[PDB]
Amino acid sequence: PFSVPNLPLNTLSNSRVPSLINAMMISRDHGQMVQFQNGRVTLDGQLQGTTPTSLSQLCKIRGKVFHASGGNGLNLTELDGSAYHAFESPAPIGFPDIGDCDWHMSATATNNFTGSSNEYQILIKQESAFAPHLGHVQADNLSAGANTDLIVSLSWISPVSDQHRHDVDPWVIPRYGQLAPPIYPPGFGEAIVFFMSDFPVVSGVNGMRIPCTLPQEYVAHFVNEQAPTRGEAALLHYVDPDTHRNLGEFKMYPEGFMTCVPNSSGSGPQTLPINGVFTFVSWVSRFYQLKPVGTA
Amino acid sequence: KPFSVPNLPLNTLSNSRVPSLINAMMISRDHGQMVQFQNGRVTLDGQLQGTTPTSLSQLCKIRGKVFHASGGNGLNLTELDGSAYHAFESPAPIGFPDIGDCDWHMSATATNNFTGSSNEYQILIKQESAFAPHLGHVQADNLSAGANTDLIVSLSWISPVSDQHRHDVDPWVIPRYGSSLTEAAQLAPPIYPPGFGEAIVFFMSDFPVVSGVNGMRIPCTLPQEYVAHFVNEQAPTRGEAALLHYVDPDTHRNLGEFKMYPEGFMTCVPNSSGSGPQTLPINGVFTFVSWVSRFYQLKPVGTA
Numbered sequence: 362p363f364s365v366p367n368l369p370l371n372t373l374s375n376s377r378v379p380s381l382i383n384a385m386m387i388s389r390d391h392g393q394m395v396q397f398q399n400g401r402v403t404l405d406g407q408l409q410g411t412t413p414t415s416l417s418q419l420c421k422i423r424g425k426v427f428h429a430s431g432g433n434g435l436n437l438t439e440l441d442g443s444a445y446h447a448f449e450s451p452a453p454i455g456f457p458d459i460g461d462c463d464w465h466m467s468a469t470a471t472n473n474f475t476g477s478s479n480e481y482q483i484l485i486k487q488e489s490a491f492a493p494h495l496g497h498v499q500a501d502n503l504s505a506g507a508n509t510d511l512i513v514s515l516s517w518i519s520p521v522s523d524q525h526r527h528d529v530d531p532w533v534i535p536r537y538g539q540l541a542p543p544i545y546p547p548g549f550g551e552a553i554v555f556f557m558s559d560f561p562v563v564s565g566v567n568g569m570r571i572p573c574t575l576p577q578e579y580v581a582h583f584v585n586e587q588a589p590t591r592g593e594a595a596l597l598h599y600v601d602p603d604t605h606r607n608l609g610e611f612k613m614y615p616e617g618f619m620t621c622v623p624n625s626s627g628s629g630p631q632t633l634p635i636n637g638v639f640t641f642v643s644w645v646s647r648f649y650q651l652k653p654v655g656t657a
Numbered sequence: 658k659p660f661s662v663p664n665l666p667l668n669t670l671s672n673s674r675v676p677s678l679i680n681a682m683m684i685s686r687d688h689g690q691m692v693q694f695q696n697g698r699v700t701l702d703g704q705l706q707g708t709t710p711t712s713l714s715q716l717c718k719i720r721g722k723v724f725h726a727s728g729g730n731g732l733n734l735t736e737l738d739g740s741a742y743h744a745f746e747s748p749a750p751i752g753f754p755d756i757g758d759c760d761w762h763m764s765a766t767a768t769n770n771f772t773g774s775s776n777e778y779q780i781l782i783k784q785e786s787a788f789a790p791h792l793g794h795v796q797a798d799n800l801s802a803g804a805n806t807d808l809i810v811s812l813s814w815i816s817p818v819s820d821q822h823r824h825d826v827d828p829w830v831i832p833r834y835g836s837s838l839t840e841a842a843q844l845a846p847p848i849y850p851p852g853f854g855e856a857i858v859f860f861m862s863d864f865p866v867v868s869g870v871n872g873m874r875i876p877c878t879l880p881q882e883y884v885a886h887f888v889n890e891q892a893p894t895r896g897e898a899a900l901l902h903y904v905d906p907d908t909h910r911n912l913g914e915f916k917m918y919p920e921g922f923m924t925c926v927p928n929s930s931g932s933g934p935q936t937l938p939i940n941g942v943f944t945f946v947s948w949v950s951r952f953y954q955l956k957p958v959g960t961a
């Protein structure tokens with residue numbers, strides 16, 4: 362039988378940055394199409410894009426340092442050190458999927474870590490030399506010796522160094538060179554539900570907020586259960602865990618995203634409490650029409 | 658509601674004491690006769706203990722407001738979602754690091770109007786007199802942020818104590834949460850190997866550790882994703898121990914048997930003073946077989 366975790370939203374992580382969920386929102390501006398490569402899984406538990414099972418892999422890069430005149434960089438591996446296969450994913454698993462911005466990152470030596478001299482604050486730009494699908498990225502302020510093995514964490518993001526735009530749009534994915542497919546709102550006034558987390562973002566279009574389509578812990582749940590998809594959509598109730606009151610109904614599609622219908626041009630799930638739990642009710646057809654959620 | 662463990666290969670899951678992929682299993686006679694880790698702690702029926710979070714997004718994080726004092730700067734702790742820390746329910750805020758008797762090198766970001774490089778702070782949290790997380794404050798070195806600044810702080814690396822009283826990092830020990838003043842309340846209880854010739858199984862991850870007793874290796878008693886699974890399922894504990902097989906996910910062969918106790922830890926029996934599960938592949942899955950008595954005798958696992 363299909364289930365979603367019996368876990369309050371505000372105890373779970375974003376699937377695009379390692380940060381607690383603190384809000385739900387819908388977006389007319391940005392919610393017309395999304396093609397996030399992280400937080401992507403089918404309801405029967407098929408991982409897509411660069412999506413890991415574990416948050417320990419999310420927004421991480423691993424590789425060996427190269428030195429070139431045009432600039433230093435990393436020859437990418439998987440985070441466990443095994444070889445990256447171009448034919449399996451658009452980048453190594455857990456590779457950040459926030460496009461068209463500067464990545465400020467913290468790299469540590471994986472071999473004989475000595476301390477401060479084996480930690481490197483580096484800048485990865487999304488310019489010509491950014492080719493994760495080919496297995497290499499260019500890094501600025503990377504002083505480590507050639508062939509040094511580094512594990513790299515995303516610290517913060519900021520507007521592109523080359524100034525071709527002055528803000529960060531976290532709704533866009535990188536130009537990698539097997540992309541998780543685009544997701545569109547399915548029709549009849551349904552809007553994609555985005556799980557929001559705060560993250561250090563300089564001049565973000567939505568501020569210091571990062572959207573995703575699934576809590577990370579839902580991803581691990583589907584990959585574990587592998588429950589057969591027995592319908593066109595899973596009808597969910599969002600319920601108060603104390604009272605067991607139905608705060609609103611939502612559809613989860615086999616592609617592994619959620620929709621609601623907002624109340625007459627309203628904010629939809631944005632006004633709901635964030636300490637609620639989603640609960641599977643039943644499989645429903647494409648024809649099923651959701652009771653509008655939230656305020657006018 | 659039947660008890661289960663996640664059908665997920667070990668090497669795709671996280672340590673529950675640092676956010677790092679599991680790359681090994683080991684037993685320890687030296688360190689493994691008692692452990693009292695505060696993270697990765699949950700009962701098989703899904704009761705969180707110590708400082709253990711559901712989500713890895715909370716693990717090895719600190720949140721607080723900066724204070725400036727003569728003795729030095731520090732953080733007045735909150736929970737990671739910014740809500741107030743109450744001493745009664747935990748030894749420290751949820752997800753607070755539980756690696757004792759070492760220096761914490763950490764990365765702090767401003768949670769309000771983040772401007773860039775000047776709103777990221779490389780800071781040092783020492784475990785000396787002013788380390789009092791249970792009382793809701795820690796002293797922080799090399800912290801330049803203005804008073805009352807709200808910071809979210811991630812563990813970057815750990816190293817031997819600044820005060821030189823030891824020269825290595827023992828990741829098997831937990832912090833003194835109440836300092837010299839009090840013993841912290843709601844500590845997750847100590848755990849010992851229960852059965853005949855049984856050793857506690859430790860899930861190992863690589864982490865930047867300077868001069869670690871086990872090098873760059875951090876032990877825990879549960880993969881983090883198992884914690885979220887038990888808290889989700891809340892399966893009634895119907896026996897004294899859960900018998901598991903560790904199975905090849907493709908091949909499907911049973912690579913060894915293990916016992917999981919209601920306290921939320923696992924044991925094996927090593928072969929004649931051997932490395933036990935250390936020689937097993939790390940891409941296996943644990944599978945629930947049945948409820949057995951505490952007395953049930955495990956087939957020895959591993960070589961030597």
Ligand SMILES: CC(=O)N[C@H]1[C@H](O[C@H]2[C@@H](O)[C@H](O)[C@@H](CO)O[C@@H]2O)O[C@H](CO)[C@@H](O[C@@H]2O[C@H](CO)[C@H](O)[C@H](O)[C@H]2O)[C@@H]1O
Pocket residue numbers: 476477760781816817818819821867
């Ligand atoms: C190997 C060593 O001694 N490392 C320490 C480092 O030494 C410097 C320098 O002072 C030294 O003369 C020379 C080689 O011996 O070059 C090295 O780069 O100095 C740093 C900075 O203080 C120490 O780091 C600190 O050590 C503390 C324990 O004594 C504690 O772990 C702190 O957290 C850590 O920052 C090196 O230990």
